Symmetry: C2
Subunit: 89 residues, 2 copies
């Protein structure tokens, strides 16, 4: 319940909010991932369909069409680095 | 200001809350990192001095005694994976 735990908890809750909708409840399908990106991230709302499709491919490291929690965490890490760098310039 | 952005923002704010105290304002010294671990994470409060010292070494990937944002993000990723796995069992 400490500050960092709560932040991490939010990240985890958002993943499952979308991953549990269809197919494997533990992975994000293209549809689930696109919705998560568009509704949960500011940059997601700025991206156009073509850009999102390519971004999702890059996130799908093992190219199995699904984004598991590990792949999602990698995405979060990248977003955090971008965030830190921006708030730095 | 969207949900995932806020979670990421919290992660970033916590880093700087401690990193800006001494030396390089952009990196966490051993002292700053130990305080962050002990006060911002539940598991941090459970760890004893010896365990924390070793954990900090592992987080310091390039072994320069400081933990930069990138190294901190790696730590966060690991914590997120642990969190997800625990809330799964
Ligand atoms: Ca799913
Ligand atoms: Ca995958
Ligand atoms: Ca510092
Ligand atoms: Ca380092």
């Amino acid at each position: 319940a400490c500050p960092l735990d709560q932040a991490i908890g939010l990240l985890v809750a958002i993943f499952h909010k979308y991953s549990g909708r269809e197919g494997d409840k533990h992975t994000l399908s293209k549809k689930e991932l696109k919705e998560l990106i568009q509704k949960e991230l500011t940059i997601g709302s700025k991206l156009q369909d073509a850009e999102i499709a390519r971004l999702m491919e890059d996130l799908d490291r093992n190219k199995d069409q699904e984004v598991n929690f590990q792949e999602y965490v990698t995405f979060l890490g990248a977003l955090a680095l971008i965030y830190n760098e921006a708030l730095k310039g």
